Amino acid sequence: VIKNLNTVLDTTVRHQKQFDETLVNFETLITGLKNRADPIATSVADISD
Amino acid sequence: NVLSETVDQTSPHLSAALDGVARFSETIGKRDEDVKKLLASANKVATVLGDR
């Protein structure tokens, strides 16, 4: 457990800046999509139909 | 007298406790550098998680 967890954690630390930025970017994207979810879902259904 | 009777009562249950504590303590004692590096990396990752 110690060995594998240390391996994964140092792997994440090597990309610490990107791992920190991606949470913010993903939250921004998901919020922007949720604020228009109903038009987006309606548009997807209309495209399929 | 209190110390004498306490040692007389807790003696039979001490060897197993000492053995188990020694084994479990050595489990982390023989991996000190690994544990410390794990704690540092976990500090970085948990700080990133908590800040976001």
Coordinates of N, CA and C in Angstrom, one line a residue:
Chain A
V1 N 0.8 -1.2 0.0 CA 0.0 0.0 0.0 C 0.9 1.2 0.0
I2 N 1.9 1.3 0.9 CA 2.8 2.4 1.0 C 3.5 2.7 -0.4
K3 N 4.0 1.6 -0.9 CA 4.8 1.7 -2.2 C 3.9 2.2 -3.3
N4 N 2.8 1.6 -3.5 CA 1.9 1.9 -4.7 C 1.3 3.3 -4.5
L5 N 0.9 3.6 -3.3 CA 0.3 5.0 -3.0 C 1.4 6.0 -3.2
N6 N 2.6 5.8 -2.8 CA 3.7 6.7 -3.0 C 4.0 6.9 -4.5
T7 N 3.9 5.8 -5.2 CA 4.1 5.9 -6.7 C 3.1 6.8 -7.3
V8 N 1.8 6.5 -7.0 CA 0.7 7.3 -7.6 C 0.8 8.8 -7.2
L9 N 1.1 9.0 -5.9 CA 1.1 10.4 -5.4 C 2.3 11.2 -6.0
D10 N 3.4 10.6 -6.2 CA 4.5 11.3 -6.9 C 4.2 11.5 -8.3
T11 N 3.5 10.6 -9.0 CA 3.0 10.8 -10.3 C 2.1 12.0 -10.4
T12 N 1.2 12.1 -9.5 CA 0.3 13.3 -9.4 C 1.1 14.6 -9.1
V13 N 2.1 14.5 -8.2 CA 2.8 15.7 -7.9 C 3.6 16.2 -9.0
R14 N 4.1 15.3 -9.9 CA 4.9 15.7 -11.1 C 4.0 16.6 -12.0
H15 N 2.7 16.4 -12.0 CA 1.7 17.2 -12.7 C 0.8 18.0 -11.8
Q16 N 1.4 18.5 -10.7 CA 0.6 19.2 -9.7 C 0.0 20.4 -10.2
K17 N 0.7 21.2 -11.0 CA 0.2 22.4 -11.6 C -1.0 22.1 -12.5
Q18 N -0.8 21.1 -13.4 CA -1.9 20.8 -14.3 C -3.1 20.2 -13.6
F19 N -2.8 19.3 -12.6 CA -3.9 18.7 -11.8 C -4.7 19.7 -11.0
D20 N -4.0 20.8 -10.6 CA -4.7 21.9 -9.9 C -5.5 22.7 -10.9
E21 N -5.0 23.0 -12.1 CA -5.7 23.8 -13.0 C -6.9 23.1 -13.7
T22 N -6.8 21.8 -13.8 CA -7.8 21.0 -14.5 C -9.1 21.0 -13.7
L23 N -9.0 21.0 -12.4 CA -10.2 21.0 -11.6 C -11.0 22.3 -11.8
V24 N -10.3 23.4 -11.8 CA -10.9 24.7 -12.0 C -11.5 24.8 -13.4
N25 N -10.8 24.3 -14.4 CA -11.3 24.4 -15.8 C -12.5 23.5 -15.9
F26 N -12.5 22.3 -15.4 CA -13.6 21.4 -15.5 C -14.8 21.9 -14.8
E27 N -14.6 22.6 -13.6 CA -15.7 23.2 -12.9 C -16.3 24.3 -13.7
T28 N -15.5 25.1 -14.3 CA -16.0 26.2 -15.2 C -16.8 25.7 -16.4
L29 N -16.3 24.6 -17.0 CA -17.0 24.0 -18.2 C -18.3 23.4 -17.7
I30 N -18.3 22.7 -16.6 CA -19.5 22.0 -16.2 C -20.6 23.1 -15.8
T31 N -20.1 24.1 -15.1 CA -21.1 25.2 -14.7 C -21.6 25.9 -15.9
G32 N -20.8 26.2 -16.9 CA -21.3 26.8 -18.1 C -22.2 26.0 -18.9
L33 N -22.0 24.6 -18.9 CA -23.0 23.7 -19.5 C -24.3 23.6 -18.7
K34 N -24.2 23.6 -17.4 CA -25.4 23.4 -16.5 C -26.3 24.6 -16.6
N35 N -25.7 25.8 -16.8 CA -26.5 27.0 -16.9 C -27.3 27.0 -18.2
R36 N -27.0 26.1 -19.2 CA -27.8 26.0 -20.4 C -28.2 24.6 -20.7
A37 N -28.2 23.8 -19.7 CA -28.5 22.3 -19.8 C -29.8 22.1 -20.5
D38 N -30.9 22.8 -20.1 CA -32.2 22.5 -20.8 C -32.2 22.9 -22.3
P39 N -31.7 24.0 -22.7 CA -31.6 24.2 -24.2 C -30.7 23.2 -24.8
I40 N -29.6 22.8 -24.2 CA -28.7 21.8 -24.7 C -29.4 20.4 -24.9
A41 N -30.1 20.0 -23.8 CA -30.8 18.7 -23.9 C -31.9 18.8 -25.0
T42 N -32.6 19.9 -25.0 CA -33.6 20.0 -26.0 C -33.0 19.9 -27.4
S43 N -31.9 20.6 -27.6 CA -31.2 20.6 -28.9 C -30.7 19.2 -29.3
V44 N -30.2 18.5 -28.3 CA -29.7 17.1 -28.6 C -30.9 16.2 -29.0
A45 N -32.0 16.3 -28.3 CA -33.2 15.5 -28.6 C -33.7 15.9 -30.0
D46 N -33.8 17.2 -30.3 CA -34.2 17.7 -31.6 C -33.3 17.2 -32.8
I47 N -32.0 17.2 -32.5 CA -31.1 16.6 -33.5 C -31.3 15.2 -33.8
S48 N -31.5 14.4 -32.7 CA -31.8 13.0 -32.9 C -33.1 12.7 -33.6
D49 N -34.1 13.5 -33.2 CA -35.4 13.3 -33.9 C -35.4 13.7 -35.3
Chain B
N1 N 3.1 -0.9 47.6 CA 2.2 -2.1 47.5 C 1.3 -2.0 46.3
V2 N 0.9 -0.8 45.9 CA 0.0 -0.7 44.7 C 0.8 -1.0 43.4
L3 N 2.1 -0.6 43.3 CA 2.9 -1.0 42.2 C 3.2 -2.5 42.2
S4 N 3.4 -3.1 43.3 CA 3.7 -4.5 43.4 C 2.5 -5.3 42.9
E5 N 1.3 -4.9 43.4 CA 0.1 -5.7 42.9 C -0.3 -5.4 41.5
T6 N 0.0 -4.2 41.0 CA -0.3 -3.9 39.6 C 0.6 -4.7 38.7
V7 N 1.9 -4.8 39.1 CA 2.8 -5.6 38.3 C 2.5 -7.1 38.4
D8 N 2.0 -7.5 39.6 CA 1.6 -8.9 39.7 C 0.4 -9.3 38.9
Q9 N -0.5 -8.3 38.7 CA -1.7 -8.5 37.9 C -1.5 -8.4 36.4
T10 N -0.7 -7.4 36.0 CA -0.6 -7.1 34.6 C 0.6 -7.9 33.9
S11 N 1.4 -8.7 34.7 CA 2.5 -9.4 34.1 C 2.1 -10.4 33.1
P12 N 1.1 -11.3 33.3 CA 0.8 -12.4 32.3 C 0.3 -11.8 31.0
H13 N -0.2 -10.6 30.9 CA -0.8 -10.1 29.7 C 0.2 -9.1 29.0
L14 N 1.4 -9.1 29.4 CA 2.4 -8.1 28.9 C 3.2 -8.6 27.7
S15 N 3.6 -9.9 27.7 CA 4.5 -10.4 26.7 C 3.8 -10.3 25.3
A16 N 2.5 -10.7 25.2 CA 1.8 -10.7 23.9 C 1.7 -9.2 23.5
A17 N 1.3 -8.3 24.4 CA 1.2 -6.9 24.0 C 2.6 -6.4 23.5
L18 N 3.7 -6.7 24.2 CA 5.0 -6.3 23.7 C 5.3 -6.8 22.4
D19 N 5.0 -8.1 22.1 CA 5.3 -8.7 20.8 C 4.5 -8.0 19.7
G20 N 3.2 -7.9 19.9 CA 2.4 -7.2 18.9 C 2.8 -5.8 18.6
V21 N 3.0 -5.0 19.7 CA 3.4 -3.6 19.5 C 4.7 -3.5 18.8
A22 N 5.7 -4.4 19.1 CA 7.0 -4.4 18.5 C 6.8 -4.7 17.0
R23 N 6.0 -5.7 16.6 CA 5.8 -6.1 15.2 C 5.2 -4.9 14.4
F24 N 4.1 -4.4 15.0 CA 3.4 -3.3 14.3 C 4.2 -2.1 14.2
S25 N 5.0 -1.8 15.2 CA 5.8 -0.6 15.2 C 7.0 -0.8 14.1
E26 N 7.5 -2.0 14.1 CA 8.6 -2.3 13.1 C 8.0 -2.2 11.6
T27 N 6.7 -2.5 11.5 CA 6.1 -2.4 10.1 C 6.3 -1.0 9.5
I28 N 6.1 0.0 10.3 CA 6.4 1.4 9.9 C 7.9 1.8 10.1
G29 N 8.5 1.3 11.1 CA 9.9 1.6 11.4 C 10.9 1.3 10.3
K30 N 10.6 0.1 9.6 CA 11.5 -0.3 8.5 C 11.2 0.4 7.2
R31 N 10.2 1.3 7.1 CA 9.9 2.1 5.9 C 9.8 3.5 6.2
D32 N 10.7 4.1 7.0 CA 10.6 5.5 7.5 C 10.7 6.5 6.3
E33 N 11.7 6.3 5.4 CA 11.8 7.2 4.3 C 10.6 7.1 3.4
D34 N 10.1 5.9 3.1 CA 9.0 5.7 2.3 C 7.7 6.4 2.9
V35 N 7.6 6.3 4.2 CA 6.4 6.9 4.9 C 6.5 8.4 4.8
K36 N 7.7 9.0 5.0 CA 7.9 10.4 5.0 C 7.7 11.0 3.6
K37 N 8.2 10.3 2.6 CA 7.9 10.7 1.2 C 6.4 10.6 0.9
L38 N 5.8 9.6 1.3 CA 4.3 9.4 1.1 C 3.6 10.6 1.8
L39 N 4.0 11.0 3.0 CA 3.3 12.1 3.7 C 3.5 13.4 3.0
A40 N 4.7 13.6 2.4 CA 5.0 14.9 1.7 C 4.1 14.9 0.4
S41 N 4.1 13.8 -0.3 CA 3.3 13.8 -1.6 C 1.8 13.9 -1.3
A42 N 1.4 13.2 -0.2 CA 0.0 13.4 0.2 C -0.3 14.8 0.7
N43 N 0.6 15.5 1.3 CA 0.4 16.9 1.7 C 0.2 17.7 0.4
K44 N 1.0 17.5 -0.6 CA 0.8 18.3 -1.8 C -0.5 18.0 -2.5
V45 N -0.9 16.7 -2.6 CA -2.1 16.3 -3.3 C -3.3 16.8 -2.5
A46 N -3.3 16.6 -1.2 CA -4.4 17.0 -0.3 C -4.6 18.6 -0.3
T47 N -3.5 19.3 -0.3 CA -3.5 20.7 -0.4 C -4.2 21.2 -1.7
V48 N -3.8 20.5 -2.8 CA -4.5 20.8 -4.1 C -6.0 20.5 -4.1
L49 N -6.3 19.4 -3.5 CA -7.8 19.1 -3.4 C -8.5 20.0 -2.5
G50 N -8.0 20.4 -1.4 CA -8.7 21.3 -0.4 C -8.8 22.7 -1.0
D51 N -7.8 23.2 -1.6 CA -7.9 24.5 -2.2 C -8.9 24.6 -3.3
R52 N -9.3 23.5 -3.9 CA -10.3 23.5 -5.0 C -11.5 22.7 -4.6

